[PDB]
């Protein structure tokens, strides 16, 4: 009926992010693309009705009714494009829609000057509690989830210091362990060989 490619898709900044959606009913007449940010609601971004391209800013929808597919291309992708994209197709003449299952798209920043480092940060209210921050690594690094029941490691997150035109990746780790050091977390979600690893002061 309506099928979208599975995902998640990881796209480097500046490249084209693309989604394809095939449909079974040759006589389908309306085709939609929706964008949905994490934990928000789907918003319509494009509708398309005839063969070829339809352009809106960095978005291009394309329709091929002979091969029965519709696609969304995101040109010059940026991290803020990261979202779930869903196609929808009309299935009757009352307006019923069938949605594809959605594809998660993550656009990774272009890190021109990696400065990977692991830092230990202390609580503002209590010097006794701390977290670890692995930051400034290039987007090809993967942060593996914790394998220890008592250690916690987050997914990597992309931060934009807009005034500085500076983006950076980071991940956070912590534990309620007495013997716990930062290297216990960040080195199974392995760091690169040029990581700056200052001793805690």
């Amino acid at each position: 009926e309506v099928e979208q490619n599975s995902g998640p898709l990881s796209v480097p900044e500046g490249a084209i992010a693309s989604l394809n959606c095939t449909y079974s009913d040759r006589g389908s007449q309306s085709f939609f693309w929706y964008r949905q940010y994490s934990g928000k609601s789907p918003e319509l971004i494009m509708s398309i009705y005839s063969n070829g391209d339809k352009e809106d800013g960095r978005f291009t929808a394309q329709l091929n009714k002979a091969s029965q597919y519709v696609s969304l291309l995101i040109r010059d992708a940026q991290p803020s494009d990261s979202a779930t994209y869903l196609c929808a197709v009309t299935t009757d003449s009352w307006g019923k829609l069938q949605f594809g299952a959605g594809t998660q798209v993550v656009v990774t920043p272009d890190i021109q000057n990696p400065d990977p480092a692991v830092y230990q940060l202390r609580d503002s209210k209590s010097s006794d509690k701390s977290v670890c921050l692995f930051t400034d690594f290039d987007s090809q690094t993967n942060v593996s989830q914790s394998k220890d029941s008592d250690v916690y490691i987050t997914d990597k997150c992309v931060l934009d210091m807009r005034s500085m035109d500076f983006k950076s990746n980071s991940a956070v780790a912590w534990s309620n362990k007495s013997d716990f050091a930062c290297a216990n977390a960040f080195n199974n979600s392995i760091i690169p060989e040029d990581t700056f690893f200052p001793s805690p002061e």
């Binding site: 319509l44 609580d123 500085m164």
Partner: protein
């Protein structure tokens, strides 16, 4: 334009649960969907006019009502844990376009015992000195832990204003025990500023976590404080050293 009666609900298994979708746009069509990881959106039920309803793709466990055109009520006769989900309603009509307009969504968590509801603890962690000297930037980390359900909204406030530039919050809260159905959650966020900004002692950095839990119409017979909807925050002041 399209509203839903609740943004966040936590319910006990067995409870009858009503979700309201209301549109004052006179739209003939309304739809109810749920959304889950790995299955996307699935149609539960829809309606082509007042007094009509048709089972969607996954109608079992649900029923609906449309006695008035503006309101499409979704009913969970007896909530089960597998009905924990993001519920989305939408409406449309026969116009120049037939596109659907979505409500804001309702996150429902169905738990076997309300005893497992917990507010987050929240702490703010100050920028490393080695980070400041290596990079001339300062990263603050906000950490919220031990909460259930995962119904939280985190925001950073600098000198009283909500900021967005320089912020990154984990898109997913992490289960503090992923094998567990009733695992509590954690969530982190980063805010990064220039070192000179952090080194100004008059600069105030607040992390605020809005948590949605029990309403006052919920009874509580426990020793610990009732885990109600509340804001939990932590702060740091800039430091010249």
């Amino acid at each position: 334009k399209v509203t839903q009666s609740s943004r966040y609900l936590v319910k006990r298994t067995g409870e009858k649960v009503f979700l309201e979708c209301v549109q004052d746009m006179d739209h003939e069509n309304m739809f109810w969907y749920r959304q889950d990881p790995g299955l996307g959106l699935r149609l539960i039920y829809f309606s082509y006019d007042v007094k009509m309803k048709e089972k969607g793709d996954i109608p079992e466990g649900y029923s609906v009502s449309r006695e008035k055109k503006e309101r499409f009520s979704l009913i969970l006769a007896s909530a089960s844990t597998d009905q924990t989900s993001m519920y989305l309603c939408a409406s449309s009509f026969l116009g120049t376009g037939v596109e659907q307009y979505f409500g804001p969504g309702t996150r429902l968590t169905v738990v076997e015992d309300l005893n497992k509801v917990f507010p987050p603890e929240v702490a703010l962690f100050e920028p490393s000195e080695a980070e400041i000297s290596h990079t001339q930037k300062a990263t603050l980390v906000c950490l919220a832990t031990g909460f259930y359900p995962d119904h939280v909204e985190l925001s950073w406030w600098v000198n009283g204003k909500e900021v967005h530039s320089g912020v990154c919050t984990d898109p997913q809260p992490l289960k503090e025990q992923p094998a567990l159905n009733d695992s509590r959650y954690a969530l982190s966020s980063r805010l990064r500023v220039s070192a000179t900004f952090w080194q100004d002692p008059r600069n105030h950095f607040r992390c605020q976590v809005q948590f949605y839990g029990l309403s006052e119409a919920d009874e509580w017979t426990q020793a610990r404080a009732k885990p109600v909807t509340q804001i939990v925050s932590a702060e740091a002041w800039g430091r010249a050293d």
